[PDB]
Amino acid sequence: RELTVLDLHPGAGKTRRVLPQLVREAVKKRLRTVILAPTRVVASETYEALRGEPIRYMGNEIVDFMCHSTFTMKLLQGVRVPNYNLYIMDEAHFLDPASVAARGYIETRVSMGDAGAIFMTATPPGTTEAFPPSNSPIIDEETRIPDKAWNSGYEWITEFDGRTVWFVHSIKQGAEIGTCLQKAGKKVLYLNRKTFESEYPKCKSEKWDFVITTDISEMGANFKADRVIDPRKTIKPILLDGRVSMQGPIAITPASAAQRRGRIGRNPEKLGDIYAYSGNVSSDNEGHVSWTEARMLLDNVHVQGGVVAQLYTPEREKTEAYEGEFKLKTNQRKVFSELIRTGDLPVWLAFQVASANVEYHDRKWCFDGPNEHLLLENNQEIEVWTRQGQRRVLKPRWLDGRITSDHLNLKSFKEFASGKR
């Protein structure tokens, strides 16, 4: 029947209260259901909250449970996914192309009449509120926030008795800020897409003063913190002139701001929680590669009894691609899939390689581009050594700035260019 959007503000208990109720009534109604979590960690949390329920986390059960990206990857690979009666997407505002594509596929199943769906998020796609409601009042304090280490000033930061979550725009900025705080005698934990599963439980088991986080904490983290610091900055990949550039620091979206702020004001009985922020929010993200990558995915997903899925309705404005534009042949699509799935390449990059008819195992495109595509890190070229042991610098045929945007991406691309995966 329905695509229901339920806008539960942060702390409303989507996962702990609402979702278990929804799963109970889906089981009672004998609805074949999937629950889509944005991340593995959220998935694990959600599984706990749903103990006692007949859930298959990816005897007999009618309710499945997996990540957004697992879901659309299965669709990309042509491995059969059930004709679900009910799709529940948690954190349905997530902007990763895999989530955006999943949204579009699901609205297509609902529109075809195969299923109902529920999209759960504090900040629904199309809505624009940066100061949503909270369990407890939040003090919004517009202020001056350092973008680098400081020798003096900003005493409001260090003269504070409680726990602060500080959102930075990169691992590198987080390193410079956290060390400055450690120098000032503060106990600090660092959270990024890598270090999360080791350092996140330490938010509980350990005493701390500051958590320095990337946008990884934007969904996926219950802190018992007293303050959030948010300069509202991100670095985003932009498509222009047949290449992807990292641009920033630039303003985050209202949805991200709301989620950052939403880390606090979640205990009804505790009043002094503070949101310390600067800068404005922006919806002008049409240049973001994400929207194109979502189409590259959706153009390569078969829908039984249908045609190419369009993006979720309020997100269709974000791209001008015609449908089927990024459609690949069978073998090319196979290469595209694995370049993303196993190679860990960004979607846009995986698309250029595959559509050029390069085989998965053939990594010469990583070295034989034009001189203008020489990759640099700390202002220097990157010497690699291939499987045969070859003196080659990184210089890809297609330039995606994400290769060198941080050390995790570069290490991963170096391994790929070497023929490791």
From Swiss-Prot:
It is a peripheral membrane protein. It comes from the Viruses. The modification N6-acetyllysine is found at K194. A motif (DEAH box) lies at residues 90-93. Residues 1-421 are cytoplasmic. ATP binds at L8, H9, P10, G11, A12, G13, K14, T15. It is found in: Host endoplasmic reticulum membrane. The record marks R260, R263 as: Involved in NS3 ATPase and RTPase activities. Residues 152-319 form the Helicase C-terminal domain. Acetylated by host KAT5. Acetylation modulates NS3 RNA-binding and unwinding activities and plays an important positive role for viral replication. Residues 1-142 form the Helicase ATP-binding domain. The record marks K14, R263, R266 as: Substrate binding. Forms a heterodimer with NS2B. Interacts with non-structural protein 2A (via N-terminus). Interacts with NS4B. Interacts with unphosphorylated RNA-directed RNA polymerase NS5; this interaction stimulates RNA-directed RNA polymerase NS5 guanylyltransferase activity. Displays three enzymatic activities: serine protease, NTPase and RNA helicase. NS3 serine protease, in association with NS2B, performs its autocleavage and cleaves the polyprotein at dibasic sites in the cytoplasm: C-prM, NS2A-NS2B, NS2B-NS3, NS3-NS4A, NS4A-2K and NS4B-NS5. NS3 RNA helicase binds RNA and unwinds dsRNA in the 3' to 5' direction. This is Serine protease NS3. The chain holds residues 1679 to 2108 of 3410 of the full protein.
